[PDB]
Amino acid sequence: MVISEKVRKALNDQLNREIYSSYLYLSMATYFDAEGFKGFAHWMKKQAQEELTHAMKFYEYIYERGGRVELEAIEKPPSNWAGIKDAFEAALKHEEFVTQSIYNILELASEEKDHATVSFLKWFVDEQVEEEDQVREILDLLEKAYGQMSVIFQLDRYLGQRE
Amino acid sequence: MVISEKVRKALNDQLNREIYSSYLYLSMATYFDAEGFKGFAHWMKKQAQEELTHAMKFYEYIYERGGRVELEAIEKPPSNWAGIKDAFEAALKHEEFVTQSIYNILELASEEKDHATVSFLKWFVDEQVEEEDQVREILDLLEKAYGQMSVIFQLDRYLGQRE
Ligand SMILES: [Fe+3]
Ligand SMILES: [Fe+3]
Ligand SMILES: [Fe+3]
Ligand SMILES: [Fe+3]
Numbered sequence: 517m518v519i520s521e522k523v524r525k526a527l528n529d530q531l532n533r534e535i536y537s538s539y540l541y542l543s544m545a546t547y548f549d550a551e552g553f554k555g556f557a558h559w560m561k562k563q564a565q566e567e568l569t570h571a572m573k574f575y576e577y578i579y580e581r582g583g584r585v586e587l588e589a590i591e592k593p594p595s596n597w598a599g600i601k602d603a604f605e606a607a608l609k610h611e612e613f614v615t616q617s618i619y620n621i622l623e624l625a626s627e628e629k630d631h632a633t634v635s636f637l638k639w640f641v642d643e644q645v646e647e648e649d650q651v652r653e654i655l656d657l658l659e660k661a662y663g664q665m666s667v668i669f670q671l672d673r674y675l676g677q678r679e
Numbered sequence: 680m681v682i683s684e685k686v687r688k689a690l691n692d693q694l695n696r697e698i699y700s701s702y703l704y705l706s707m708a709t710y711f712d713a714e715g716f717k718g719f720a721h722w723m724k725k726q727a728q729e730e731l732t733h734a735m736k737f738y739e740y741i742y743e744r745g746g747r748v749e750l751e752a753i754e755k756p757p758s759n760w761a762g763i764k765d766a767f768e769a770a771l772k773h774e775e776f777v778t779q780s781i782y783n784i785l786e787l788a789s790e791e792k793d794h795a796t797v798s799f800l801k802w803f804v805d806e807q808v809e810e811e812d813q814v815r816e817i818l819d820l821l822e823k824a825y826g827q828m829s830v831i832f833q834l835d836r837y838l839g840q841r842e
Binding site: 550591 | 705706712724738748749751752755756
C-alpha cells in the first residue's frame with residue numbers, strides 16, 4: 517500500500533519536470549518582456565507560478581504516501597524565440613510532452629493497482645487538457661490576426677489581465 | 680541612465696543566485712519532510728517562496744533599467760544534512776554568502792556611478808540582515824535543545840506556524 521519505488525520515481529521525475537516547466541515559462545517571460553509584450557510576459561509569470569503549484573502537489577503526495585523527494589539540476593531553458601507564435605508553439609509542444617509523461621505514470625500506477633496514485637493523477641490528466649487548450653486558443657487567436665498588430669496588441673492587453 | 684553591462688550582468692547573476700536560494704530551501708524542506716519535521720519543512724517552503732520574490736524584484740529592476748534577463752542552469756542542491764542544526768547552519772552560511780554577493784554589486788554600482796542601482800540595493804542590504812538574524816535565532820534555539828527530541832518538538836511546531 518506504500519508507493520512502490522518505481523511509482524515514487526516516476527512521480528519524483530514528474531515533480532522535477534514541473535519545476536523545469538515553471539522555469540521555462542519564466543524564460544518565455546524574459547523574452548516577451550525584452551520584446552515589449554508586457555501582457556504576454558505577465559501571462560507567462562502567472563503560468564510559472566501555476567507550474568510551481570503542480571510541482572508541490574507531487575511533492576506533498578510523495579510524502580503522504582511515505583516517499584521522499586530529491587531535487588535534481590534544472591537545465592538552462594531557451595531564452596529567445598523567433599516571434600510570439602514560435603514561443604507559444606514551444607509552450608504547446610512542451611505541455612503535450614508533459615501530458616504524455618503524466619499518462620505514463622497513470623499506466624504504471626494502474627498496472628501496479630495503486631488506486632490512490634491513479635486517483636491523484638486524475639486531477640492532472642484533466643488539468644493537462646485545459647493547459648493545452650489555453651495555449652491552443654492563444655495560437656488560434658494569433659493566427660486569426662494574420663498580420664494585424666492592432667489585434668496582436670489587444671491580445672497582449674487581454675493576456676495581461678490574467679488573475 | 681542607464682545600466683552598464685557590468686552592472687546588468689551583476690544583477691542577472693544575483694537573480695539566478697536568488698533562484699538557487701529558493702531551490703536550496705525547497706531541498707532543505709525535502710530533508711525535513713523526510714525526517715518527519717513538517718514544521719521545519721513548512722518554514723523552508725515559506726522561505727523558498729520568499730527567495731522567489733527576491734528574484735522577481737531583480738527581474739523587474741533589470742527590465743525597468745532597459746536590460747534583459749537570462750536564466751541560467753540551476754545546480755542540483757544538497758538533499759541531505761546531519762541533523763536539523765546542521766541544515767540551518769548551511770542556511771546561515773548561504774545567507775552570509777548572499778549578503779556578500781549583494782555588497783559586491785553595491786560596490787560595483789557605486790564605483791560605476793550608478794546611483795539608481797545603489798538606491799535599489801538598499802532594500803536587500805536591510806533584508807539580508809534579518810535573513811541572517813532569523814536563521815541565527817533558530818540556530819541558538821536548536822543549540823539549547825541538545826539531543827532532546829522534546830525541545831525540538833516545540834521548535835518544529837513554532838516554525839510550522841510561519842505565515
Ligand atoms: Fe504542469
Ligand atoms: Fe503545465
Ligand atoms: Fe534572497
Ligand atoms: Fe535569503
